[PDB]
Amino acid sequence: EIFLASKRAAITYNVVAEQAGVLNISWIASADSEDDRRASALNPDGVTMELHSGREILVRLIRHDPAVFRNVQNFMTANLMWAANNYGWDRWTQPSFGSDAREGWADFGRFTRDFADAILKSSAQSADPVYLVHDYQLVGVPALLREQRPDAPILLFVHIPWPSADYWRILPKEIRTGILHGMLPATTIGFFADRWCRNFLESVADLLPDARIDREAMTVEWRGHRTRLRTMPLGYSPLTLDPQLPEGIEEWADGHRLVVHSGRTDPIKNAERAVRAFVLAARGGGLEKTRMLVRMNPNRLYVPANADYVHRVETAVAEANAELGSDTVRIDNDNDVNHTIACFRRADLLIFNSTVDGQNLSTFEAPLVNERDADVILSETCGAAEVLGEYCRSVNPFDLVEQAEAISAALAAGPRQRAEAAARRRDAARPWTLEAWVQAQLDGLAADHAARTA
Amino acid sequence: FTGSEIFLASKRAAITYNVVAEQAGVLNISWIASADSEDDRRASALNPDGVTMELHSGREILVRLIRHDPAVFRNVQNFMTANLMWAANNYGWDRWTQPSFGSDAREGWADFGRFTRDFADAILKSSAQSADPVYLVHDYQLVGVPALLREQRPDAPILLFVHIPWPSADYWRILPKEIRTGILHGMLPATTIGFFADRWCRNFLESVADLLPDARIDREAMTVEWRGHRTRLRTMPLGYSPLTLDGRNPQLPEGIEEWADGHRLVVHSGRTDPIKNAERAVRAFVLAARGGGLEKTRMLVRMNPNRLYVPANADYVHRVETAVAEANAELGSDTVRIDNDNDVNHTIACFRRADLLIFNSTVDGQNLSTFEAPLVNERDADVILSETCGAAEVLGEYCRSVNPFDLVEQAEAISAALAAGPRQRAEAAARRRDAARPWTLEAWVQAQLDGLAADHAAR
Ligand SMILES: OC[C@H]1O[C@H](O[C@H]2O[C@H](CO)[C@@H](O)[C@H](O)[C@H]2O)[C@H](O)[C@@H](O)[C@@H]1O
Ligand SMILES: OC[C@H]1O[C@H](O[C@H]2O[C@H](CO)[C@@H](O)[C@H](O)[C@H]2O)[C@H](O)[C@@H](O)[C@@H]1O
Ligand SMILES: [Mg+2]
Ligand SMILES: [Mg+2]
Ligand SMILES: [Mg+2]
Ligand SMILES: [Mg+2]
Ligand SMILES: [Mg+2]
Ligand SMILES: [Mg+2]
Ligand SMILES: [Mg+2]
Ligand SMILES: [Mg+2]
Ligand SMILES: [Mg+2]
Ligand SMILES: [Mg+2]
Ligand SMILES: [Mg+2]
Ligand SMILES: [Mg+2]
Ligand SMILES: [Mg+2]
Ligand SMILES: [Mg+2]
Ligand SMILES: [Mg+2]
Ligand SMILES: [Mg+2]
Ligand SMILES: [Mg+2]
Ligand SMILES: [Mg+2]
């Protein structure tokens, strides 16, 4: 009786996919490629997939209008909404919204309707449907489901940050209020971090004059709807972690301590500042036997900011080597999860210094697989820092001096200090499994639902 | 405050041989400010007690200039206060690419601690032969001063009044740890902290709650309790100084009256500062005009040069020039003009002539022009006002309140303002003047005194 939906499914012929497997339910997601459109058309029952975890799932892909989907993905969600929720605008010079934003918003409504139709069509014969709506791209869905199913439990879980009210307000009026209107009819809105729940509540208080927020209870009362905000942290999926280095890396790292920065090709991952911080720390000859690997996993390169970030990182690494000597810093840029885990295991120092991050799962996974008791530098603005920051070197991701000094201190630490820190850090990470988080969703929603309906 | 001597301090005294200057005039008290130059130091040495200065408003004040170490000051001014600190509180960083703080930021903090001890020392020396001093400390360069005054004058009323925004907690947190905490430690010992807008007070309380684990905030009482100090946050709006708006009819700058002659005139006016948002103003104008529709309309971008040595400000001027060049290329030659000077007679004259006034700041501590301009305007000009100006909390309901980042919204507001008839414009402008008129400098000074006295009484 549980229905699960999220936009992104990268199929070839994922946390939401693992959750589908845990609950043994179908997963409604978007067809993006032509192959998905064909597979979906040819397979009305859904497409079956085995995940690495060994879980096997059924995925129902929605065939959107291709132009609507193109605009929504490339412009609205991955670019505009991304910069709105992940703090990428300077205000002085960007953004400047024109007609494109309005057409994007209309297209967004159409995409939203596609998901609501799929979810309602699929649940139509269900007497007591439970709706789990995942991701920021589906923020419009709860209002549509609520209109048809006034009594259904609806969780909206957002995997990315929620920005401060002043920053949320950057968006065009129809969009900044329209998104909030779409979300509040949910029974429960979930984020990974208290800071995001707080920012959400402030955004609502600021923009919606009829809303009453309660900061202590973390609730909104708005036009009938009572909505509860919950923080439900996620760390890792053990079954997905249950590898070998990329080519050249083991021999290149052989006689050295290895610093690893790892993340998507997304500006929030902050590899440019990580490299510049390493350079400050290595500035001759502050460090001698150390190399740095920048592991990048290509993702949404249809966004200009993402392409431009890659170039900025490449430029920084070349400048690093020009300074520190040839082959001090390398980039390895592929989407092999096996390579990522291998890099995690080999690291002497792990850097997850994001400008901001909804959670950051790498900061749980990496210490859990690392067999060198690697120290971890973690940005204070990652959702993960609310659970793990006391066990890592928590840093301001904009301060190169602070980061360089953390790098230097981490590499100076002996194996006995590193052993003890790493043990505490693993102990803190270990409870935050995918299975526990799924349970947290259902438990939170069940509790809130009784009050929501009342 | 019977029996009290009041002391007023602020950094900026652009004296060549200002709101704080007018306040010194209102209260008949000396103004302690920074010697920027060699001339300033000489004048201050020659006149230990102070230099007499007539303001154009007609008031006469005594100004006492503090000699700083020349290098300390140039760095505090050029890098810290004109540039780094400005971007922090006026929202000029994208986070993805800027800022990246290096060793210069830590040295800058150290220099800032010096400039701060300079002011606190001078203030305390000046008040040393006073039994019951009252300290009015103005604007963001002096954020460190209240802690030092409190340390040496535990029972003195201290107001710190910040003229610029206070940013959201997440944004304030961009700053290096020593600075983001250090500045809060500096401010909280004040009896009262004032801002021009409620939003700034709210953001300040959030920053304190976020960074200072020892502090307790009350969002409704607007208070902080931290390590002993109870601090009250107050919103004290300021609009205009009537003594700068009376007197003879001002004259327009060279050629403007001719050029604007047969046309409706859109005026954007402001300092050469990215927050003033002229580039978007011009692009919104172009969207509203093209192609036909605003045929008898011209646009004047009045810029007042200030801090052009800051790269962000130089870049802004370049972007505006570029947008004006592109506007003219599109709409026809000489449709949009830039006119730059710091002539206040020219500014008032342009306010007077405007058919449409645009004050569309990306953010603004208050913006006083949005009060002055409707008060002197002779044409019932409409006002487009950014919702992110502190002024909008008082005047937003009486103007066309816009999201300053939305070109479509702004173009539609330009079109709607110019489509309005004389009776609608007359009625709107009368309500707008009525809403603006009470917010005088004199009333704001009284608000400072009244708030401080009340908060001090709650010792
Ligand atoms: O499509 C947006 C991103 O979704 C994922 O990342 C978000 O959700 C993660 C947990 O599922 C968080 O750790 C992270 O902070 C969020 O950005 C996905 O991992 C990314 O590849 C996507 O860009
Ligand atoms: O030195 C910073 C600026 O100070 C003034 O502007 C601030 O204070 C004004 C009121 O005194 C507000 O209207 C404005 O929003 C603030 O930015 C001064 O007018 C500016 O020239 C200075 O750059
Ligand atoms: Mg997307
Ligand atoms: Mg992007
Ligand atoms: Mg808001
Ligand atoms: Mg609600
Ligand atoms: Mg990543
Ligand atoms: Mg991304
Ligand atoms: Mg991105
Ligand atoms: Mg950098
Ligand atoms: Mg930290
Ligand atoms: Mg001077
Ligand atoms: Mg200054
Ligand atoms: Mg500052
Ligand atoms: Mg400051
Ligand atoms: Mg510091
Ligand atoms: Mg504290
Ligand atoms: Mg006056
Ligand atoms: Mg006169
Ligand atoms: Mg008090």
Side-chain angles (χ1 to χ4, degrees), chain A residues 180 183-187 189 200 204 208 211-212 219-229 452:
Chain A
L180 294 182
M183 304 167 65
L184 290 172
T187 306
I189 297 168
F200 180 80
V204 167
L208 299 190
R212 284 169 171 242
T219 58
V220 184
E221 277 178 347
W222 176 70
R223 295 189 188 171
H225 318 276
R226 164 197 169 82
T227 314
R228 168 76 188 268
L229 278 279
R452 157 91 201 169

Side-chain angles (χ1 to χ4, degrees), chain A residues 8 82 159-160 192 264 299-300 357-361:
Chain A
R8 295 189 71 192
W82 195 253
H159 293 224
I160 68 171
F192 284 127
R264 313 304 299 188
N299 186 83
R300 309 165 135 181
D357 229 327
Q359 184 74 334
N360 202 304
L361 300 187

Side-chain angles (χ1 to χ4, degrees), chain B residues 96-133:
Chain B
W96 292 353
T97 72
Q98 303 187 272
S100 288
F101 297 107
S103 63
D104 285 347
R106 307 313 180 69
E107 279 171 281
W109 181 237
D111 282 350
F112 187 75
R114 287 176 202 100
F115 169 84
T116 300
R117 290 189 279 91
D118 270 343
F119 262 90
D121 281 350
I123 296 161
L124 293 159
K125 167 173 173 70
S126 181
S127 59
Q129 299 189 53
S130 289
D132 288 280

